[PDB]
Structure 1
């Protein structure tokens, strides 16, 4: 009684549908391995969350600049721009901080509920009871979302499909920067100016 991504299409046996967003869409038969499904769901969560973060960080500056509130440079040349700190130094700081963060995440994934305790101050005790959703004061301050059964399903579906939308949108933005030398919203303006003569087939 669960809608499928394709009407009248039989869902894969392993794709039960209990997990949020499971619409029986696995054409490549990739997730049939017993040990791969958890890795797939965690990877999709991380991918969608970082993709939507990057989607905000890309779309908001260009939109604000074209409105007029801000006067920030574009994303596809920001790396080659004047900064107080050297680019390599910043990158090393980034990789170190992310090494700590993901190391914690990887330890959580491999060993369930093993790194919920803060070493320096053992009086924190993260509250998350599911892998990939640690919650806690640092990551879930207000406490929204956590409720009864079938309440988490709809909001997690919202999260995963919003992340999918943002991820495909950011792929589109990168493809734009590869094909046109201007921001995607300016391409929206161009598509609005002459819609029947401005599309993908026009200047492929």
Structure 2
């Protein structure tokens, strides 16, 4: 199944075959050789990619809208050390308790697909999803889209999601490291780079 590759002139790894969404035969280290580990890795990829989408949004959009617009969030790096409705070391435990349920349901789905597709309270609110990592139902795909019967448009949308998500992952890693080193926010750094593309770089520290 010849397809575009990360490295045009390379033989695709045998275990990869292009069926998975966003599969470009990029396994230089041969980590996803074992099929079961490959399945686990694709689930991990999906979850990291979505969490990175959310993190990039919440890191940049507020900071895109502070130098302009209205929302004056001072920074995302010092956003943690603030005051809120509840303290930090117990907000953490509240988050852990609230997330244990959902994370356990997803874990059970990964180990045993289909066992966690029913609402525990009312045994009628199913989820209508047979592809792992994409439950669907009415909390995850409320606005119809998400299924296409038997076609490949869904595969294209899957690839779009994977690719946007890898971009978001890289962007948030850049946000973290570039905040750690430049001692400054991301958006003003972008503006400064645009001002002087040449001298303002990773070398003028």
Instruction: Pick the TM interval, shorter chain.
Output: over 0.9
Counterpart in 1 of 2:160? 158
Counterpart in 1 of 2:112? 111
Mapped to 1, the partners of 2:139 and 2:196 lie a distance apart of: 48
CA shift, 1:150, in A, is: 0.7
Counterpart in 2 of 1:23? 24
The normalised TM-score by structure 2 is 0.96
* RMSD value, Cα: 1.0
CA shift, 1:84, in A, is: 2.7
Counterpart in 2 of 1:190? 192
CA shift, 1:88, in A, is: 1.2
Matched, 1:175 2:177: yes
Mapped to 1, the partners of 2:9 and 2:68 lie a distance apart of: 46
Q: Unaligned regions of 5+ residues in structure 2, if any?
A: none
Q: Is the Cα–Cα contact under 8 Å of residues 136 and 146 in structure 2 kept in the other structure?
A: no
Q: Unaligned regions of 5+ residues in structure 1, if any?
A: none
CA shift, 1:181, in A, is: 2.0
Q: Is the Cα–Cα contact under 8 Å of residues 43 and 133 in structure 2 kept in the other structure?
A: yes
Higher helix share: 1
Matched, 1:69 2:39: no
The normalised TM-score by structure 1 is 0.96
Structure 2 residue matching 1:19: 3-state secondary structure? coil
CA shift, 1:34, in A, is: 2.9
